[PDB]
Design a protein around this ligand. Structure first.
Ligand SMILES: [Zn+2]
Ligand SMILES: [Zn+2]
Lengths: 135, 194, 56, 48, 114, 728
């Protein structure tokens, strides 16, 4: 029923791939979370070249409320986010190839590769330093 | 702090929206920048297909043109354990991801690398200014194929046999003069001409 | 030896025994003397069986 | 000998695909052409 | 003696001769791309050489303790501090020549007293 | 003052503390304690899966029920030595009791053992998926004396005499059938490490590189990988041998089949300085060899048959080849499904190392260097035997469960014969000296369980810290018999037997300690967190100077600044946040960083010297106050050697690191600006030179003042002297 050809419409959306520290990734990658609630705020210079993250107080002050975001690659090429789901239910050529069709659509273009690092000056920070030291 | 910045709390994607929907990361290996919307000839189809004899496979335009023209057990067994997620991953990767445009000009074959799929998290700015938080389950890497009209396996096996000390330095040139195994784009162009 | 600067060919650096038994050696020289003694021991302990075979 | 660059210039005479054949020629020249003396003899020392 | 690769694909360009124009051409034996030859040089051998002695000259040479220090001066900065080490070419027919690199001028120069 | 420096005399207090803490037999004791605390629950939970879900053994049968027979082992348990005689109650044993009664000072074991189904008639499918007791007895195994679970490990001198054994009996032997029994270390070449050899001229191979591997220690995973360089000439070609491929294969084909088609990328994986060329010239013929194939699966399509019986096939399954390359190829860095790129980079690294030796840029490898060896000990040996016997156990468990097609599940009585098997096997291995099951002495090097000598206390101590390697029956005369420079301060340079074994058996120096290994996962996670370039996105062009990073011989990533990472790791170790057994080396010349945390390394203590000094030139960190506190602690009859370790005053050094450290023999040799003969960049000073000896040589007065072979004669002979050996 659905068109087998992928959608090319949703491509034009910039995407920021973020490498995330283990403690924070454990929380955010949880499926129990992700209800749509806001989690943190971002700060961008008018001059640019410096990005820091302002985490909301929902963290229960067990982790830093401020982080610095460093663009590992300011310019990014040939990296995109495509989404997948189930579909509704010498000149010799090979007739049978066993195609398997899925519903697919490309939804964004990656433009900024950046990593979240805890700001050592943060008062709640440097605690995860001892936590990582123990482990 | 003095308002030298744009502040806005990023908001998560709704939970109920996420389920039954899978989001993956796409990668191309190419020195030159490639834009899928412009370079590729729509319609573009993404299928999970067997990659054996990719050259012999007909183009989507070629397929459409062809369609239009037509119009005792041992009873005792023990199975070693394997992780269910690993089994599912193996089943999914049994067939590679293969993407083609209608023209057949550019073809790309994906592969799965598990190096950093778990740690990486997706963030793209929403229309309102929020940043959409997506756990990235898998990351796929696509490579170009058949652009240079590759030679087939059997003749390669014959060549590697030490019949000659060195293969002809112009063997590819002679084959191209014979035009054997034309490119999928070339085959599609020939079919369109016919 | 890990007590020396690299790339030295001075006799002490590369194992010349300077002192005499009367005063007594120094750690490094002691080690080198041990090396020589071990060499002699093993070479004789092998030549004995070999040359016995030849003699027979 | 007047020239201070000891250089030899040779070309194959034929009335094309030079890489393999000429590399083989070079290998033959380097490891096949004796100059003087008798093979299976190496550095010889003069003793008084 | 450097090697070029096809712009269309990272593949070695094999030299080949223009029959009529009598100039060397580099053709990608994979894809029909062809390229002009910069120099009449094709292959270079260098059976015996005295190169490769500047291998691994990291900016952090002075950081390591184990390399000995001397009092000779670099003829750029004249600072008596310097780090010296012998030839990196590990062959039996090497030379006793040494190499002096000075932390201050960050420059390498030979031990040749001549 | 308390901040004053330390006179060479004062070092003795530190030594006193170190012995008071560690104890001489620490090596043997700790090996066993490690093998008991862990590696046993691990070896069980690793392979605790066994299920017989007889759904219907054929379609229908309607359906039938998914007759799961699930058996799994949970936590294990160990007991104090607790042995009952015939027809009697169980006694709480004691070492002298077993020793006089010819018992085996062992203790029993028992482990917990664990249907609800999923059903499927044909269509749909893919969702078609007991105990009878608890903590069932499984056998009994011997125990180490004064181990964690030995009665003596807590005795007081009064109580110790109550039990009637000499308090000087420090040492972990074994009591088998009433006979003191001791195992001896076995040195072996360390695995998972690159080596290159220059084979003899007549053979068509001139340079070879070999890799060994293991999994600790499933299936034994030997899996030797070797790459050979052919020809002397245009025969320059590189081929590799891979199981189960029985032909030599051109490496270019391997790269392509791995998933790297464009030749330039493969060149990038071998050559690093694009400016240099020579390696490209010698690669040229290799590139020419693989000029014919241009697709990954086509390269995979190469047969490399070696068997087994060809299953579903046309000529060769691409699936077969990829399953080989993932599951079996290179059992280290990864073996699951999806890390072709890691394999490619590591293989390119090894190719580059091979190519250097042929290009004379770097010299021949040294097999006899000590650091690249290891010392297998009680822990690993018992691990091997327990693994083998438990595999036999599981195979027998599968038997007699398939036999009971009818009723019922035993769960009780077969395990009794199983316990007999496990106990008998352990007893046989520890008593006979043969090492393995009753396999007709196959692969059974005998010298593993020698009988403990008991003549002189000196001899007895000089029999615990003992080593042995297999080389041959007669012996060669240019290989490790002669001493080596690397042996400094780790193995006594005089305490060796003579004759047909000289230079084979060797004896640990005084403070030398053995490495018990540690999980590397926290270390690698920390390293990645602090900034690592995962190799998945590495590129030589943008990293013309970056430094490679290795852990236990696995490449993980590349980093830009090595210096800050080096100092940070050093500081974190010194602060005590990492097990000090871990050793790292920065080969600044080679632009390389190594991390080692395996088990079986050999290391010695050392003073740390701070280059900086407010007082002036240079100084070792420890001062007089610390040693005064040490003396006070000792005479109290609370500083320990550990308490010295935590605050960064002494640091362990493995045999590998010394190639990156400068040592000062005396604490005053050059620190400031007839009897005998006596740079400025020291980092560590020897605690005391007289500690390079072993047990027996220590007795020799003034060993400096006599000829070395005479010292060796005395070291061997002194063990043949009478006196006292105990008090009981
Ligand atoms: Zn090309
Ligand atoms: Zn200078």
């Amino acid at each position: 029923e659905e068109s087998l050809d992928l959608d090319l419409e949703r491509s034009n959306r910039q995407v920021w791939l973020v490498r995330l520290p283990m403690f924070l990734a454990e929380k955010w990658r949880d499926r129990n979370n992700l209800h749509g609630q806001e989690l943190g705020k971002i700060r961008i210079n008018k001059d640019g070249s410096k990005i820091t993250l302002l985490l909301n107080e929902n963290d229960n002050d067990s982790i830093p409320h401020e982080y610095d975001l460093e663009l590992t690659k300011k310019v990014v090429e040939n990296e995109y986010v495509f989404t997948e789901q189930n579909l509704k239910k010498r000149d010799r050529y090979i007739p049978y190839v066993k195609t398997i069709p899925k519903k697919t659509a490309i939804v964004g273009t990656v433009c900024h590769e950046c990593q979240v690092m805890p700001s050592m000056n943060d008062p709640n920070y440097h605690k995860i330093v001892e936590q990582r030291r123990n482990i | 702090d003095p308002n030298e910045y744009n502040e806005f709390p990023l908001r998560a994607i709704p939970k109920e929206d996420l389920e039954n929907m899978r989001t993956h990361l796409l990668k191309f290996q190419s020195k030159k920048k490639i834009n899928p919307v412009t370079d590729f000839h729509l319609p573009v189809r993404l299928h999970r297909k067997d990659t054996r004899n990719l050259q012999f496979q007909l183009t989507r335009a070629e397929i459409v043109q062809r369609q239009k023209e037509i119009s005792l057990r041992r009873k005792t067994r023990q199975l070693k354990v394997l992780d269910e997620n690993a089994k599912k991953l193996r089943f999914e990767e049994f067939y590679p991801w293969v993407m083609e445009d209608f023209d057949g000009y550019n073809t790309w074959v994906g592969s799965y690398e598990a190096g950093n799929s778990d740690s990486y998290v997706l963030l793209s700015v929403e229309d309102d200014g929020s940043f959409t938080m997506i756990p990235a389950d898998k990351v796929y890497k696509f490579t170009a194929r058949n652009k240079y009209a590759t030679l087939t396996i059997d003749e390669a096996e014959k060549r590697m046999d030490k019949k000659s000390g060195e293969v002809p330095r112009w063997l590819m040139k002679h084959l191209d003069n014979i035009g054997t195994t034309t490119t999928r784009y070339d085959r599609t162009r020939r079919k369109l001409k016919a | 030896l890990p007590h020396f600067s690299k790339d030295d060919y001075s006799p002490e650096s590369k194992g010349f025994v300077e002192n005499s038994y009367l005063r007594g050696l120094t750690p490094q020289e002691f080690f080198f003397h041990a090396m020589g003694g071990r060499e002699g021991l093993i070479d004789t302990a092998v030549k004995t069986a070999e040359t016995g075979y030849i003699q027979r | 000998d007047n020239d201070e660059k000891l250089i030899i210039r040779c070309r194959v005479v034929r009335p094309a695909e030079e890489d393999h054949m000429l590399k083989k020629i070079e290998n033959t020249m380097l490891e096949n052409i004796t100059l003087r003396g008798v093979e299976n003899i190496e550095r010889v020392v003069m003793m008084k | 003696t450097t090697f070029r690769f096809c712009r269309d694909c990272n593949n070695m360009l094999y030299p080949r001769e223009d029959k009529e124009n009598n100039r060397l051409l580099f053709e990608c034996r994979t894809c029909s791309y062809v390229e002009e030859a910069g120099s009449p040089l094709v292959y270079r051998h260098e059976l015996i050489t005295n190169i490769g002695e500047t291998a691994g000259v990291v900016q952090d040479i002075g950081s390591d303790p184990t390399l000995p220090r001397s009092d000779r001066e670099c003829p750029k900065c004249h600072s008596r501090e310097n780090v010296f080490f012998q030839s990196q070419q590990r062959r039996k027919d090497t030379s006793m020549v040494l190499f002096f690199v000075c932390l201050s001028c960050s420059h390498i120069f030979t031990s040749d007293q001549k | 003052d308390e901040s004053a420096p330390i006179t060479a005399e004062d070092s003795w207090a530190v030594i006193s503390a170190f012995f008071r803490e560690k104890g001489l037999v620490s090596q043997q004791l700790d090996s066993f304690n490690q093998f008991v605390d862990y590696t046993l629950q691990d070896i069980i939970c690793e392979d605790s899966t066994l299920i017989l879900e007889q759904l219907a053994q054929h379609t229908t049968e309607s359906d039938n029920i998914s007759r799961k027979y699930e058996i799994s082992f949970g936590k294990i348990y160990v007991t104090k030595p607790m042995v009952n005689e015939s027809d009697g109650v169980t006694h709480a044993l004691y070492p002298q009791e077993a020793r006089l009664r010819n018992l085996t000072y062992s203790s029993g074991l028992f482990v917990d053992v664990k249907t609800y189904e999923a059903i499927d008639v044909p269509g749909r499918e893919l969702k078609y998926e007991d105990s009878e007791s608890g903590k069932v007895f499984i056998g009994r195994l011997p125990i180490m004396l004064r181990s964690k679970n030995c009665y003596l490990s807590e005795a007081t001198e009064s109580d110790l005499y109550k039990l009637k054994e000499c308090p000087f009996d420090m040492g972990g032997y074994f009591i088998i059938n009433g006979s003191e029994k001791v195992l001896i270390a076995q040195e072996r070449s360390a695995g998972n490490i690159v080596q290159v050899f220059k084979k003899a001229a007549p053979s068509p191979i001139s340079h070879v590189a070999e890799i060994r591997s293991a999994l600790e220690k499933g299936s034994r995973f030997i899996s030797t990988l070797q790459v050979k360089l052919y020809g002397r000439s245009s025969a320059r070609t590189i081929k590799a041998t891979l199981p189960y491929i029985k032909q030599d294969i051109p490496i270019v084909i391997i790269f392509r089949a791995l998933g790297i088609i464009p030749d330039g990328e493969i060149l990038e994986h071998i050559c690093y300085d694009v400016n240099d060329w020579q390696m490209l010239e010698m690669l040229k013929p290799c590139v020419e060899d693989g000029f014919v194939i241009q697709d990954r699966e086509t390269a995979l399509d190469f047969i490399g048959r070696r068997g087994t019986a060809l299953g579903i096939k046309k000529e060769k399954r691409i699936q077969y080849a990829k399953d080989i390359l993932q599951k079996e190829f290179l059992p280290h860095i990864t073996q699951l499904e999806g890390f072709e790129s890691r394999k490619a980079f590591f293989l390119g690294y090894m190719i580059n190392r091979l190519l250097l030796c042929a290009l004379d840029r770097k010299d021949q490898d040294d097999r006899d260097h000590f650091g690249k060896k290891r010392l297998d000990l009680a822990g690993p040996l018992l691990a091997q035997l327990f693994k083998t016997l438990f595999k036999k156990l599981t195979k027998d468990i599968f038997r007699y469960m398939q036999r009971t097609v009818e009723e019922a599940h035993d769960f009780n009585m077969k395990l009794a014969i199983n316990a007999k098997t496990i106990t008998s096997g352990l007893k046989y291995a520890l008593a006979t000296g043969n090492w393995g099951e009753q396999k007709k002495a196959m692969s059974s090097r005998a010298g593993v369980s020698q009988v403990l000598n008991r003549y002189t206390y000196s001899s007895t101590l000089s029999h615990l810290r003992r080593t042995n390697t297999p080389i041959g029956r007669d012996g060669k005369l240019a290989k490790p018999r002669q001493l080596h420079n690397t042996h400094w301060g780790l193995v006594c340079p005089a305490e060796t037997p003579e004759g047909q074994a000289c230079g084979l058996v060797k004896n640990l120096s005084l403070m030398s300690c053995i490495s018990v290994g540690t999980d590397p996962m926290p270390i690698i996670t920390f390293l990645s967190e602090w900034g690592m370039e995962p190799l998945e996105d590495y590129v030589p062009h943008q990293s013309p100077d970056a430094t490679r990073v290795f852990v236990n011989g696995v490449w993980h990533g590349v980093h830009r600044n090595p210096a800050r990472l080096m100092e940070t790791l050093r500081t974190l170790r010194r602060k005590g946040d990492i097990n000090p057994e871990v050793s790292m080396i920065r080969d600044i010349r080679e632009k390389e960083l190594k991390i080692f945390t395996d088990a079986g390394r050999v290391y010695r203590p050392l003073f740390i010297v701070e280059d900086d000094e407010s007082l002036g030139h240079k100084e070792l960190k420890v001062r007089k106050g610390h040693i005064a506190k040490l003396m006070a602690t000792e005479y109290q009859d609370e500083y320990t050697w550990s308490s010295l370790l935590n605050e960064g005053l002494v640091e362990y050094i493995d045999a590998e690191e010394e190639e990156s450290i400068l040592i000062a023999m005396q604490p005053e040799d050059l620190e400031p600006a007839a009897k005998r003969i006596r740079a400025t960049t020291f980092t560590h000073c020897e605690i005391h030179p007289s500690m390079i000896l072993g047990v027996a040589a220590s007795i020799i007065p003034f060993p400096d003042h006599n000829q070395s072979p005479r010292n060796t004669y005395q070291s061997a002979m002194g063990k043949q002297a009478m006196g006292v050996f105990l008090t009981n």
